[PDB]
Symmetry: C3
Subunit: 333 residues, 3 copies
């Protein structure tokens, strides 16, 4: 009794930005890519299930020459066990636990989810996490779920892609369409993260909460969160980099799903850093979004995504100020 699904998609994707598009939100040009993966689960006995998952990213916008590898990477690589009432445990490359919150608004046709950085402690996909998860409080309280997650030190060649050891967890409740969630983690920073000109401190911290309605074809959701010494930042003007001492982040999203296949989306997003050594307060993300996805079926969809960038042109960090529109076609199985 083993079920494995091999899964994948090919994504025909173009970004439109005024000229450059180095001073825009999304960049400009060909952004085609494909994904492949497997997801597997085995029924060991009536109370115990084993599972694993691997997912990979193939960029489809590189030449077949020296740049062929750029942006190719594993996204997910993990296995675990799920015991009847007791819960699930898994280890590997997985979603940070705070993403159990940021998942609420990470719903745009192409952009959005700006605060769920990869290899960023608890907010995105990350390497070396042991994750425990519980549904319906041991079978006892419908809709009450929680989770804890242990993050091992990754002492990588770059500050940006590193972490020290850390712990994080999340708790959420769901009653007929509404969903409330909270998530928090902290972790040691590594001497290489600390040696950076931007960011000063020994612990990195991230939390977010999330509020959502999700029934009757409507999707409304908000997320508010903060970070100390965790959000990666770069100053376009001196080529310095490191981490934002604090940030505050809000993301809102409203969508509707028509039965004929259209799903319009409006979103708002702003993320403001504080106490950035040499600058003080400066915005990182600030935009409104309109877009839509048309779903032909479960296998085929198309979409447009328009980001109305509100970041000003004098922005102390050199964060792009121009709008970006993405157009995509998708085959997935």
């Amino acid at each position: 009794g083993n079920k494995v699904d091999l899964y994948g998609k090919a994504v025909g994707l173009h970004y439109f930005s005024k000229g450059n598009g180095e001073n825009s939100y999304g960049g400009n040009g060909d952004m085609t890519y494909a994904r492949l993966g497997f997801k597997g689960e085995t029924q060991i006995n009536s109370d115990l299930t084993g599972y694993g998952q691997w997912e990979y990213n193939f960029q489809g916008n590189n030449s077949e020459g020296a740049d062929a590898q750029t942006g190719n990477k594993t996204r997910l690589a993990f296995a675990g066990l799920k015991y009847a009432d007791v819960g699930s445990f898994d280890y590997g490359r997985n979603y940070g636990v705070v993403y159990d919150a940021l998942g609420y608004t990470d719903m745009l046709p192409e952009f959005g989810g700006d605060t769920a950085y990869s290899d960023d402690f608890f907010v995105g996909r990350v390497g070396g996490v042991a994750t425990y998860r519980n549904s319906n409080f041991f079978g006892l309280v419908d809709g009450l779920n929680f989770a804890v997650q242990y993050l091992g030190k990754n002492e990588r060649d770059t500050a940006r892609r590193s972490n020290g050891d850390g712990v994080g967890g999340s708790i959420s409740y769901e009653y007929e369409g509404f969903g409330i969630v909270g998530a928090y983690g902290a972790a040691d920073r590594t001497n290489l993260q600390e040696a950076q000109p931007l960011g000063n401190g020994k612990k990195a911290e991230q939390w977010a909460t999330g509020l959502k309605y999700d029934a009757n074809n409507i999707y409304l959701a908000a997320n508010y969160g903060e970070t100390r010494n965790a959000t990666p930042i770069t100053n376009k003007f001196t080529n310095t980099s490191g981490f934002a001492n604090k940030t505050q982040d809000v993301l809102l999203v409203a969508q509707y799903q028509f039965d004929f296949g259209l799903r319009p989306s409006i979103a708002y997003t702003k993320s403001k850093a504080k106490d950035v050594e040499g600058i003080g307060d400066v915005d990182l993300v600030n935009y409104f979004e309109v877009g839509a996805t048309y779903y032909f079926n479960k296998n085929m969809s198309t979409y447009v995504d328009y980001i109305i960038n509100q970041i000003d042109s004098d922005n102390k960090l050199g964060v792009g100020s121009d709008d970006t529109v993405a157009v995509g076609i998708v085959y997935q199985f």
Copy 2:
């Protein structure tokens, strides 16, 4: 109603060239590689089909050490829609439209197809193409097909792997075994392509025509084509590189398919550059070919391919002059 085929092959492949084989056609040594991909199509309603495709190259002749990645790349990555009578549209990494012509002679057991360069405007696989295709002139004229294709600027780190924006198209007719085809595209060159010592001009151009017989177990085909500022060239003697100001290209091919599984092949190929700054006229490809494929079934074949190099040893560009023989075994599914 979705059909996905996962497909692939493992190819046991060796090149034999006198010693080096740095002054030969094909090189010398282990050239084993594997391919994997998916091809998917979904029936959305009775007139509209969605599809996508991804194909990858794994070299099998690298160590498991630092060179493990060499020659690995995505070949194809695209999705599109196909509407009843109206035609197909797809975007991503795909075959340049002029390859609708070069496809005629690109039929050898191992070599051949010398003019269908990758990341070369319209002649090979290329990134960032929107391709429209029409069969039987909107259902109205059996055998009359056409296609147009828009190529977006790829401003890559190398001249060789770049293009500016361009348009190209192709038209072909097929009546009981015979096939006639024509194809043409042009495109902007990028300032990096132009800054090269070899090649001077703002537009790159390529066209080819193709003539073919393909029934009763016979395959005869020819292709003639020309290029301005599009064919990539390198001068072995100064380590300079860029693009051939003009080239003229002919490729011929004759094959027969015995019912017991053998398929011998004889081919001719020559490609001559003109107005190469510092040299004038110099050949790039010039050879005869004999070889054969033995097909055990649809899954298993083997083959030999022998290239009788006619390029002389004094060739002004340092193009290899030695013969090359390839031997290959293939499992594919």
Copy 3:
């Protein structure tokens, strides 16, 4: 009549070593990875079968940034034919023939198999091998198998990953649980291998023999082998590298498989180099091992592996002396 199995596993894997763990056996930290591959065989007629195989390694412990590619590689890439009584022939990336011996003890839950180096002439996976194999001496002598294998020159960018041409073979006999095997190959070294400070000679040589019991839930096996100029070595103290002039190697292993799924393992391993220019005699591997695998089913297992390192701290080459424990969870299909 074609059978293709797509296969794979996701492996949740952590190494524990005292602090560093740069002076240990296994290192320290996240060591998650996944594997994917295909294995295919086609029945061409009643006496002739075609087949091929490709297998790849995706590390799951890299970031999604610049280091994304580290330790990713093809492991296997080959195709061949199998003729009724006559035997099998295959070409590509495959297991060196001497591994028909080292296979005996390469059975640990995580470590072990220390002498079966990749890209190491005949002991591990290697590129460019033509391998012939025979079972039951042409159908005439049950349990008597042999094999020969031709290795083509790989003139790679590093000494470590190179070889010249070579031949190697193996012979083995199996009678109700017992198994005896012998294997030997030699090959030319390349001028780059020879230009190395460590290792002096024109031919590289490796042989091993293997003795085993394998029935009634017991697995006992030993291997003894020697090498001239083939075992790759590095001297931590001067950053010099190359090849051990001689080594002698023994590996022993004892395991039992309980029906409920547990499989404990005890192993011994030592490999001693000789005539290492600048040092004389120095150990390379020397440890005892205890560990266990618990098999939930064919799809799911977990395991611990504990290496009691016996290499001393004054070891002339800087070979790590600390213990290492690995813990792993595995989903495979």
